[PDB]
Amino acid sequence: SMQDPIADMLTRIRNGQAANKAAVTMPSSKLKVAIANVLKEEGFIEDFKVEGDTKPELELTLKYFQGKAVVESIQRVSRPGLRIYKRKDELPKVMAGLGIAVVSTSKGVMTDRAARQAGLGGEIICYVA
Amino acid sequence: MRHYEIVFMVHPDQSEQVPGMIERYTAAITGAEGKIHRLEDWGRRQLAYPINKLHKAHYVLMNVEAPQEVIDELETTFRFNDAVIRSMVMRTKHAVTEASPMVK
C-alpha cells in the first residue's frame, strides 16, 4: 500500500533526475506543496505547479545544470516506521552545510538553516544534497 | 430454464419405434412446461465404427429448454431402454433453431 506519500515524492524526484525526465507529476497534498515550496526556493527544482480540482496533481519541473542532475542525493530521514525529531541544537548539517535538511517545525515547513535562525527545531523530513 | 441439446442413437432394427419414442419425449418436456426448439430425425446412418457389434444406427437430434430435474429423469429413460444405444446430452448457452448442416 501507499504507506508513505512523502517518500513517494522524493523517489519520483530521484528516479526523475536519473531518467533525465523534464517534469515529474504526482498526486498533490498539503505537505507535498510545502516541500516543493522549499525545493523551488532553495534552488533544486525550477518550478512546481498544482493542477486539478477533485484529485490535484502536483507537477515538478526538474532542474539540470551542465547536462548532469542538480539533485545529487535525496533521502528520507523520518519515515512512518521510524520517526525522527530533533531539537534546535541537534539540527543536522547536510553535506557540511552545502546541502539542506527539510525540517517540519511549529512555524511551518522550512529548511534547517532557517530553523536555526527561527530558533526552534522539529521533525526532519528529508536530506537534499 | 437450462438449454440442453440431446442427441441419441437408436438400434436400427428398432427404427420403426422411433416416432413413438419422440412423441413421449416431447410430451415429457412440454408436459413439464419445457420448450422444444428443433427436432431433426437423421434417419439410418452408417457408423464410423461398429458400436455394440453392429454397423448402423438411427440418429435423432433434439433441442430442449427444460428444468434440469426432468432431464435427469429423461437420462434414465435412455439408460434402461435397449432401443437407444448411445445418448448424449449437451448443455447449450442459448436456444438454437437453425437446421443442422447434415439436415441440409
Binding site: - | 442427441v7 442413437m9 457408423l47 464410423a48 465404427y49 461398429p50 458400436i51 444406427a57 437430434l61 448411445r86 448424449m88 449437451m90 443442422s100 448442416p101 447434415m102
Partner: protein
C-alpha cells in the same frame, strides 16, 4: 491463416463433419495448429468438437479399429 477467424463463428459445430474432416488426418488424428494455422482459441474448440464427434461415431478414433 486461420479460417475460423475469417468466417467468424462463435463455436465450431461438432455435427459439421465435412468441416471437421478438413482437420483430421487419414488415420483420424487431430491435425496440429502448426500445420493448419488455426488460432489457438478455435483450436481448443475444434479439439472439443472432434472428441464429441468421435463419441457419436461421426468420426473414427483411428482408421484401423473395427
Amino acid at each position: 491463416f486461420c479460417r475460423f477467424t475469417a468466417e467468424g463463428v462463435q463455436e465450431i459445430d461438432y455435427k459439421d463433419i465435412a468441416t471437421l474432416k478438413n482437420y483430421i488426418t487419414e488415420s483420424g488424428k487431430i491435425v496440429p495448429s502448426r500445420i493448419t494455422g488455426t488460432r489457438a482459441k478455435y483450436q481448443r474448440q475444434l479439439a472439443r468438437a472432434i472428441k464429441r464427434a468421435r463419441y457419436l461415431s461421426l468420426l473414427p478414433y483411428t482408421d484401423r479399429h473395427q
